[PDB]
Amino acid sequence: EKERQNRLAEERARREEEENRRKAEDEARKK
């Protein structure tokens, strides 16, 4: 269970950092 939950949690965090760098490069284009 913990293996599964941690895997899903890192998948979530990776998607989150994807969106963060994405908004970052968007703002960069606005610059």
mmCIF file of N, CA and C in Angstrom:
data_model
loop_
_atom_site.group_PDB
_atom_site.id
_atom_site.type_symbol
_atom_site.label_atom_id
_atom_site.label_comp_id
_atom_site.label_asym_id
_atom_site.label_seq_id
_atom_site.Cartn_x
_atom_site.Cartn_y
_atom_site.Cartn_z
ATOM 1 N N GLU A 1 0.822 -1.204 0.000
ATOM 2 C CA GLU A 1 0.000 0.000 0.000
ATOM 3 C C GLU A 1 0.857 1.255 0.000
ATOM 4 N N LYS A 2 1.867 1.308 0.865
ATOM 5 C CA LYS A 2 2.728 2.481 0.929
ATOM 6 C C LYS A 2 3.527 2.634 -0.353
ATOM 7 N N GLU A 3 3.990 1.525 -0.925
ATOM 8 C CA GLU A 3 4.661 1.592 -2.217
ATOM 9 C C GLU A 3 3.759 2.246 -3.251
ATOM 10 N N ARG A 4 2.520 1.765 -3.357
ATOM 11 C CA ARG A 4 1.574 2.336 -4.308
ATOM 12 C C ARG A 4 1.338 3.813 -4.038
ATOM 13 N N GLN A 5 1.072 4.162 -2.781
ATOM 14 C CA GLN A 5 0.752 5.542 -2.438
ATOM 15 C C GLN A 5 1.927 6.461 -2.717
ATOM 16 N N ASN A 6 3.141 6.013 -2.408
ATOM 17 C CA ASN A 6 4.317 6.828 -2.677
ATOM 18 C C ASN A 6 4.541 6.983 -4.170
ATOM 19 N N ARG A 7 4.339 5.911 -4.937
ATOM 20 C CA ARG A 7 4.465 6.015 -6.384
ATOM 21 C C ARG A 7 3.486 7.039 -6.935
ATOM 22 N N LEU A 8 2.227 6.954 -6.507
ATOM 23 C CA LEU A 8 1.227 7.911 -6.963
ATOM 24 C C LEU A 8 1.572 9.320 -6.505
ATOM 25 N N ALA A 9 2.140 9.447 -5.305
ATOM 26 C CA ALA A 9 2.478 10.764 -4.778
ATOM 27 C C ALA A 9 3.600 11.404 -5.575
ATOM 28 N N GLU A 10 4.615 10.621 -5.939
ATOM 29 C CA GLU A 10 5.685 11.165 -6.765
ATOM 30 C C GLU A 10 5.190 11.467 -8.169
ATOM 31 N N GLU A 11 4.249 10.670 -8.679
ATOM 32 C CA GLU A 11 3.643 11.006 -9.963
ATOM 33 C C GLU A 11 2.915 12.344 -9.884
ATOM 34 N N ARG A 12 2.157 12.555 -8.804
ATOM 35 C CA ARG A 12 1.491 13.835 -8.586
ATOM 36 C C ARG A 12 2.495 14.974 -8.517
ATOM 37 N N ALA A 13 3.545 14.810 -7.714
ATOM 38 C CA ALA A 13 4.530 15.875 -7.549
ATOM 39 C C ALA A 13 5.252 16.167 -8.857
ATOM 40 N N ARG A 14 5.488 15.133 -9.667
ATOM 41 C CA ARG A 14 6.141 15.344 -10.950
ATOM 42 C C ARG A 14 5.230 16.104 -11.902
ATOM 43 N N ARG A 15 3.951 15.737 -11.951
ATOM 44 C CA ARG A 15 3.009 16.521 -12.740
ATOM 45 C C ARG A 15 2.952 17.961 -12.248
ATOM 46 N N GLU A 16 3.008 18.151 -10.929
ATOM 47 C CA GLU A 16 2.971 19.492 -10.363
ATOM 48 C C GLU A 16 4.171 20.313 -10.805
ATOM 49 N N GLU A 17 5.375 19.740 -10.730
ATOM 50 C CA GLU A 17 6.553 20.493 -11.150
ATOM 51 C C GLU A 17 6.534 20.732 -12.653
ATOM 52 N N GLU A 18 5.942 19.808 -13.414
ATOM 53 C CA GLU A 18 5.719 20.062 -14.834
ATOM 54 C C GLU A 18 4.885 21.319 -15.032
ATOM 55 N N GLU A 19 3.765 21.424 -14.316
ATOM 56 C CA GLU A 19 2.926 22.610 -14.463
ATOM 57 C C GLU A 19 3.647 23.860 -13.980
ATOM 58 N N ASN A 20 4.491 23.730 -12.957
ATOM 59 C CA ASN A 20 5.206 24.903 -12.458
ATOM 60 C C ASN A 20 6.221 25.411 -13.475
ATOM 61 N N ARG A 21 7.065 24.527 -14.009
ATOM 62 C CA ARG A 21 7.988 24.958 -15.053
ATOM 63 C C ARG A 21 7.229 25.443 -16.283
ATOM 64 N N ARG A 22 6.047 24.876 -16.532
ATOM 65 C CA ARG A 22 5.244 25.319 -17.661
ATOM 66 C C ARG A 22 4.778 26.754 -17.476
ATOM 67 N N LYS A 23 4.204 27.070 -16.315
ATOM 68 C CA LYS A 23 3.803 28.448 -16.057
ATOM 69 C C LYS A 23 5.015 29.369 -16.060
ATOM 70 N N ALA A 24 6.168 28.859 -15.618
ATOM 71 C CA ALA A 24 7.387 29.657 -15.643
ATOM 72 C C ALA A 24 7.766 30.040 -17.067
ATOM 73 N N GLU A 25 7.756 29.072 -17.989
ATOM 74 C CA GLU A 25 8.119 29.390 -19.367
ATOM 75 C C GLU A 25 7.040 30.231 -20.038
ATOM 76 N N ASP A 26 5.779 30.076 -19.616
ATOM 77 C CA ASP A 26 4.747 30.991 -20.098
ATOM 78 C C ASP A 26 5.064 32.426 -19.710
ATOM 79 N N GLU A 27 5.310 32.666 -18.418
ATOM 80 C CA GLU A 27 5.684 34.003 -17.966
ATOM 81 C C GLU A 27 6.919 34.506 -18.703
ATOM 82 N N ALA A 28 7.880 33.615 -18.964
ATOM 83 C CA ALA A 28 9.062 34.001 -19.727
ATOM 84 C C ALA A 28 8.684 34.487 -21.120
ATOM 85 N N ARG A 29 7.748 33.797 -21.775
ATOM 86 C CA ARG A 29 7.261 34.279 -23.062
ATOM 87 C C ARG A 29 6.586 35.635 -22.915
ATOM 88 N N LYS A 30 5.861 35.844 -21.814
ATOM 89 C CA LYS A 30 5.282 37.161 -21.561
ATOM 90 C C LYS A 30 6.369 38.212 -21.398
ATOM 91 N N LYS A 31 7.566 37.791 -21.007
ATOM 92 C CA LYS A 31 8.702 38.693 -20.933
ATOM 93 C C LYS A 31 9.359 38.815 -22.303
#
